[PDB]
Amino acid sequence: HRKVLRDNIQGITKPAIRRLARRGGVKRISGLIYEETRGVLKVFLENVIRDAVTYTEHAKRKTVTAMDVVYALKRQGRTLYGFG
Amino acid sequence: NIQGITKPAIRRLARRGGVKRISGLIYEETRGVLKVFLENVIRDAVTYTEHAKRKTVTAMDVVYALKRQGRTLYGFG
Amino acid sequence: KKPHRYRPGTVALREIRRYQKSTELLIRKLPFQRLVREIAQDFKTDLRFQSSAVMALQEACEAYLVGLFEDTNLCAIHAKRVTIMPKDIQLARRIRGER
Amino acid sequence: PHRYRPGTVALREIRRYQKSTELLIRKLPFQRLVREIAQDFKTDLRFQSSAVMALQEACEAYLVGLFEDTNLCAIHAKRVTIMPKDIQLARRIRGE
Amino acid sequence: SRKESYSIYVYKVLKQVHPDTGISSKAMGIMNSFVNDIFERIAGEASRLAHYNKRSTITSREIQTAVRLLLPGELAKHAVSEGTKAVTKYTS
Amino acid sequence: SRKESYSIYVYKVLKQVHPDTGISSKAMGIMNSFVNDIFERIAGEASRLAHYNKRSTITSREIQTAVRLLLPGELAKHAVSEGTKAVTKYTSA
Amino acid sequence: TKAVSRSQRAGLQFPVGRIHRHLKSRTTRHGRVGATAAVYSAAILEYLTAEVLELAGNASKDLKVKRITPRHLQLAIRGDEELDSLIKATIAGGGVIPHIHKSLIG
Amino acid sequence: VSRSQRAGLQFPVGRIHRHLKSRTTRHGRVGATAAVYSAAILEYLTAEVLELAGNASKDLKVKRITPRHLQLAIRGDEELDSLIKATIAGGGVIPHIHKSLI
DNA sequence: ATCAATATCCACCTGCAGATTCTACCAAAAGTGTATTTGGAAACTGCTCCATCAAAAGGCATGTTCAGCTGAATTCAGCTGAACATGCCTTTTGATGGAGCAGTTTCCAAATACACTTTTGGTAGAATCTGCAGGTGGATATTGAT
DNA sequence: ATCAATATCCACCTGCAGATTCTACCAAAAGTGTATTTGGAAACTGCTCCATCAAAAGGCATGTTCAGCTGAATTCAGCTGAACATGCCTTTTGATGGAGCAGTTTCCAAATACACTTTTGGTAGAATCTGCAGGTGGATATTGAT
Ligand SMILES: [Mn+2]
Ligand SMILES: [Mn+2]
Ligand SMILES: [Mn+2]
Ligand SMILES: [Mn+2]
Ligand SMILES: [Mn+2]
Ligand SMILES: [Mn+2]
Ligand SMILES: [Mn+2]
Ligand SMILES: [Mn+2]
Ligand SMILES: [Mn+2]
C-alpha cells in the first residue's frame, strides 16, 4: 500500500558514515570508504534481519518484535542490552 | 620453563602459519602470548577438575574449558 | 581581510571529540527505517515492525560500525597512514572472522 | 660450497610444515610447562596423557592461527617480517 | 549408563557414500565430536525456541527452525529437505 | 498482562550504594538485560556441571563453580564471598 | 508463626524465591534445585549489580548529575577491566570512551 | 521395526529421542517426529563431511579417512568451513603462501 | 635467459608392525501394547499499537570551489635476521615397580518435591515529584594568519 | 611571538516530560504435612599415572658470514577537508482505521506412563591388511656463470 521501497541503502549518507567514523576515532577518510561501508552494513543488516524474521515466522506472527531482533543478535554473538 | 618453548619450535609454528621472515623479538612475545592462553585454559580445566572432586585433570576437563572459551576442540571426546 | 579557515584536520579532530562525547544515533532515523523495511520485505512480504524492533536494529548496526571503524583505524595507523581505506576495512574484517 | 639465498629455505620450510600435521613443540618441555602452570591453581594435580595432548593441539592451533593473522598485519604494512607490533595488532582486533 | 558413541552410525554412512573407504580412529573421534557438537547446538536452539513461544514441546517445527538458524544456506535447505523426507517416510 | 522484572531489586541496591542517585528508565532496561544475561549464563553452566558429574540436583556447589568459570579474577573472589555468606546466613536460620 | 522472606532470611535484596522458581523451570527432565542454590544465585546477581551501579554512580556523580544513564553504565563497564571482559554486550545509547590516537593529533 | 529404519535412517532415532528428552525443561515433552528430524539432519551433515573427505582420501590414494582429509574437506568448502569453526586436532592447515612472500 | 652443477622434493618400492575391521557375548535400552492424561490448537474476542498520511519548518544533505598536506613512488645503506657448520645436551624411547585414585556398587538420613492453604511482596496505573534539557551569556583556550 | 576569530567550557535558570512514589489488588511466595529421591559416606579393587632409571640420537645452541629488508629521507600530483549557498526531506506530533497480538474456553490429537519382550551396541580379542620406515631414482627447482 505504501510506496515501493527501492535503493534505500543510499539513505546511509556520506555525512552519516563520516559521523560514525568520527565516533570511531577516524580523522581522514578515503573517498572509496562510503560505498565499502554501505556494502558492509547491508550484509550485516541482512544477516540480522534474516534471523529476526525466522523467529517471527516461527512464532506465527506478522510483526517483528524487539525480542525477535534481540534473539537474532544473540544468535550472532552480538548481544544487545536495553530492549528486553 | 616457558623457555623450553624454543626459538625453532616457535619458528616451525610460524612457518605452518605461512610466515617467511621473523623478527628477533617475536620469540619472547610468543612465549608471553602462549603463557596467557595456557593459563586461561588450565584455570578453567582445573575448575572443572575440582568440581568433580577429582585430583587428575581429564581430557574432558580440557575440552569443556576450551569450549567455554570459544575455542572448541574436536577429537578428544 | 581574509576569511578564517581552519587547517585540514582541525575540524575533523573537533568532530571526533564531539561525537565521542555524545551518545545519540548518527544515522537518520526515517532512512534507516526504510532500509530495514526494504530488506525485511525482501525476506517476507507484508511484515510489520514494532518501533522498538527498528530502534534495536539501529543501535546494533551503529555499534557494529563504530567498532569496525575503530579496528579499521588501527589498521590504517599500522601502515603509517591517518587515512582509512577499503583495504583497512577488509583487513579488520578478515582478522575478525567476518566474511 | 653451495649456499641458498636468504628466504629460499624459509619458503621451503613453509611448504614443508603446511604439508604436515605433526605437533611442532617438543613433548616433554610442553608437558613441563603445563604442570608448572597448573601448580598455581591446585596442588598434586595429575594429568591424563590425553589431556596434555589436548592442551597441545589447542595451543599449537591457536598459535598457528595467530601467526596467519600476524602475517596479514605485516603484509598490510608492506613488510615480509612479522614483528611484535603485528602480533599486538592482530590480538587487539581479535578482542584478546 | 552405557558409554555411547556415534561410531557405528558414522561407519554405516561411510559405507553408504564410499563403500571402499575406511576411517582412522582419530578421524572417528573427530566425527563423534562433530556429531555431538551439532546435536547440542540444534537441541539448544530448539529448546529456546519452544520457551520463547511459551511451549514445552520440542517438535520437528522447532528442529526445522533451529536448522534454519544454525546452518549456512545451501546446507540449511538440503538439511531441511532431508529432515522433511525422513518425517514423511516415518509417518507413512 | 502482568510482567515481572528485576527493576525494584536493582533500585534497592542502587539506594544502598548511592543513596542520592536515581536511574533513567533506559539504564534500568540495561540493568534488567544484564541481570537476565548473567542469570542465564550461570544457570546453563550449572546444569551442564550437574550433567557432567551425573548429579540430578543443581546445588550451591554447581552455582559456585559456574561463578568461578564465568567471572574474571577479583570479581570471582568477591562474588564467591557474597554467595557463601548468604548461604551460611540462610542455613543458620 | 508469621511468614519470613527467604530473601530476608538470606540477608539479600534480590528475590530468592522467584530465582528459585526460575531455576526449577530451566533445568533437566527430572532436575531438582537445592535450597541454597537460589540463595547463592541471588547473592551473585545482587553483588554484580552492586558493582556495576557503584561505578556507574561514581561516573554520574563526577559529571554532576543525579541519574544514571546508559552513558554512565558504558563508561563504568568499559572503564573497568574485569567488568569489560565480563560484559561484551552492546550497551544501547552508551557511546564510546574518548580516545584519539597519538599519531592523529598534529 | 526400529524407528530409524521406518524413517530410512542410519542414525539412531530412539537414542536421539532419549537425548532430546534429557534436554527439556521441567514438564518438557518431545514430539513424535522431532527425533526423526534431528537424526536426519545429523546423518545428512555426517554424509556431506564423509563424502568430501573420502574424495580427498581417494585422491591421495589411501584407503582411510584421517583428520587431515577431514580438515581439507571442511576448510575447502565455504559452507562447512563456516559451520565448523572447531579445531580439527591433527588436521594441520590448508597450504597457502601469500603472493608477496614468493 | 642458456646451461651446466647441485640440492631437494616426490612418487614409488617392499616387509611387516600394528592399527583397523571383524566377531560374538550380553547388560542396557529400544519398541510394543495398553492405558490415561494433557498441552496447545482452534475459535472467539478485546483492544493495543502499527501503517500511513498530514503539515510545517528548520536541521541537515548535497554539490561545488580551492589548496593543504597526504599517500604514493623512489632510493639506499645500516644492520638484522637467514643460512650453515659444528658440537653438545635435552628429549625421546624403552622399561619397571606401585602408590594413588578413579570408577563401582550399597544404603539411607538428609534433602527436595508436591498439593493445598495463608499471606504479602510486587505490579499496573495514577498521582506526585523534580532533574535536566535546552536555552543564555560570558570567560578561556585554541587556532591560524600576520 | 601578537591579535582577531571562533570554538569550547562553564556558570546560571525553569517547567515539563520523565522518574519516583502511592495505592490496592492479587499472583505467587511461604507454611504445613507428607512422599519420594539422592548424594555422599563407606568399603572395594584394578587401571593408570608417577617416579626412577638408563642409553643415545636427533635436534637445539652458538658463532660466522653477508644478503637484502626495513626504515629513513625526499618529492610532488592530486585527493580530500573546510566552507558555504541552496533547498528538501527528516523530525515531530496527531488522526484514523483496522491488522493482528493477546486473553479465554474447550476438548482432542498428541503426548506421557508402565510392564514386558526383543533388539542393540560397547567391549575386547582375533583376524586382516594398511600405511610407515626407509630406501631409490627420477622430476623439479635453485644457484652461479655467462
Ligand atoms: Mn524488495
Ligand atoms: Mn484422572
Ligand atoms: Mn490443559
Ligand atoms: Mn650491503
Ligand atoms: Mn504489602
Ligand atoms: Mn545543558
Ligand atoms: Mn549388533
Ligand atoms: Mn618416508
Ligand atoms: Mn645407494
PDB file of C-alpha atoms in Angstrom, chain A residues 16-74:
ATOM      1  CA  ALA A  16      26.242   9.725   8.432  1.00  0.00           C
ATOM      2  CA  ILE A  17      29.170   7.447   7.679  1.00  0.00           C
ATOM      3  CA  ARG A  18      31.627  10.259   8.486  1.00  0.00           C
ATOM      4  CA  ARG A  19      29.932  10.784  11.872  1.00  0.00           C
ATOM      5  CA  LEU A  20      30.149   7.047  12.635  1.00  0.00           C
ATOM      6  CA  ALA A  21      33.847   7.025  11.711  1.00  0.00           C
ATOM      7  CA  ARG A  22      34.434  10.080  13.928  1.00  0.00           C
ATOM      8  CA  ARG A  23      32.869   8.336  16.913  1.00  0.00           C
ATOM      9  CA  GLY A  24      35.264   5.547  15.982  1.00  0.00           C
ATOM     10  CA  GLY A  25      38.226   7.933  16.195  1.00  0.00           C
ATOM     11  CA  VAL A  26      38.875   8.303  12.450  1.00  0.00           C
ATOM     12  CA  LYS A  27      40.457  11.566  11.268  1.00  0.00           C
ATOM     13  CA  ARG A  28      40.697  11.118   7.482  1.00  0.00           C
ATOM     14  CA  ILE A  29      38.591   9.018   5.105  1.00  0.00           C
ATOM     15  CA  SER A  30      39.256   7.724   1.585  1.00  0.00           C
ATOM     16  CA  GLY A  31      36.542   8.587  -0.937  1.00  0.00           C
ATOM     17  CA  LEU A  32      36.048   4.845  -1.505  1.00  0.00           C
ATOM     18  CA  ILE A  33      35.073   4.157   2.145  1.00  0.00           C
ATOM     19  CA  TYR A  34      31.428   5.253   1.740  1.00  0.00           C
ATOM     20  CA  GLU A  35      30.428   2.576  -0.758  1.00  0.00           C
ATOM     21  CA  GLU A  36      32.505  -0.034   1.066  1.00  0.00           C
ATOM     22  CA  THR A  37      30.693   0.860   4.257  1.00  0.00           C
ATOM     23  CA  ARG A  38      27.323   0.628   2.542  1.00  0.00           C
ATOM     24  CA  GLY A  39      28.149  -2.874   1.352  1.00  0.00           C
ATOM     25  CA  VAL A  40      29.307  -3.990   4.783  1.00  0.00           C
ATOM     26  CA  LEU A  41      26.267  -2.515   6.500  1.00  0.00           C
ATOM     27  CA  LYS A  42      23.859  -4.144   4.083  1.00  0.00           C
ATOM     28  CA  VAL A  43      25.385  -7.572   4.716  1.00  0.00           C
ATOM     29  CA  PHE A  44      25.285  -7.080   8.485  1.00  0.00           C
ATOM     30  CA  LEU A  45      21.715  -5.886   8.444  1.00  0.00           C
ATOM     31  CA  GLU A  46      20.551  -8.624   6.082  1.00  0.00           C
ATOM     32  CA  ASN A  47      22.031 -11.282   8.304  1.00  0.00           C
ATOM     33  CA  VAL A  48      20.428  -9.919  11.462  1.00  0.00           C
ATOM     34  CA  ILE A  49      17.070  -9.396   9.810  1.00  0.00           C
ATOM     35  CA  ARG A  50      17.108 -12.872   8.281  1.00  0.00           C
ATOM     36  CA  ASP A  51      17.293 -14.410  11.730  1.00  0.00           C
ATOM     37  CA  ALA A  52      14.822 -11.988  13.254  1.00  0.00           C
ATOM     38  CA  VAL A  53      12.294 -12.897  10.598  1.00  0.00           C
ATOM     39  CA  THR A  54      12.958 -16.594  11.149  1.00  0.00           C
ATOM     40  CA  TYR A  55      11.971 -16.065  14.782  1.00  0.00           C
ATOM     41  CA  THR A  56       8.945 -14.048  13.713  1.00  0.00           C
ATOM     42  CA  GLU A  57       7.865 -16.802  11.390  1.00  0.00           C
ATOM     43  CA  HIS A  58       8.422 -19.484  13.981  1.00  0.00           C
ATOM     44  CA  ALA A  59       6.074 -17.598  16.337  1.00  0.00           C
ATOM     45  CA  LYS A  60       3.418 -17.396  13.555  1.00  0.00           C
ATOM     46  CA  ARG A  61       3.432 -13.593  13.755  1.00  0.00           C
ATOM     47  CA  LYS A  62       3.207 -10.868  11.140  1.00  0.00           C
ATOM     48  CA  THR A  63       5.068  -8.374  13.347  1.00  0.00           C
ATOM     49  CA  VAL A  64       8.801  -8.398  14.005  1.00  0.00           C
ATOM     50  CA  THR A  65       9.194  -7.713  17.699  1.00  0.00           C
ATOM     51  CA  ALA A  66      12.138  -6.208  19.509  1.00  0.00           C
ATOM     52  CA  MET A  67      12.650  -9.664  21.084  1.00  0.00           C
ATOM     53  CA  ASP A  68      12.961 -11.278  17.638  1.00  0.00           C
ATOM     54  CA  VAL A  69      15.765  -8.789  16.995  1.00  0.00           C
ATOM     55  CA  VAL A  70      17.387  -9.327  20.411  1.00  0.00           C
ATOM     56  CA  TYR A  71      17.334 -13.091  19.878  1.00  0.00           C
ATOM     57  CA  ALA A  72      18.785 -12.759  16.366  1.00  0.00           C
ATOM     58  CA  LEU A  73      21.589 -10.548  17.666  1.00  0.00           C
ATOM     59  CA  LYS A  74      22.319 -13.052  20.428  1.00  0.00           C
TER      60      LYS A  74
END
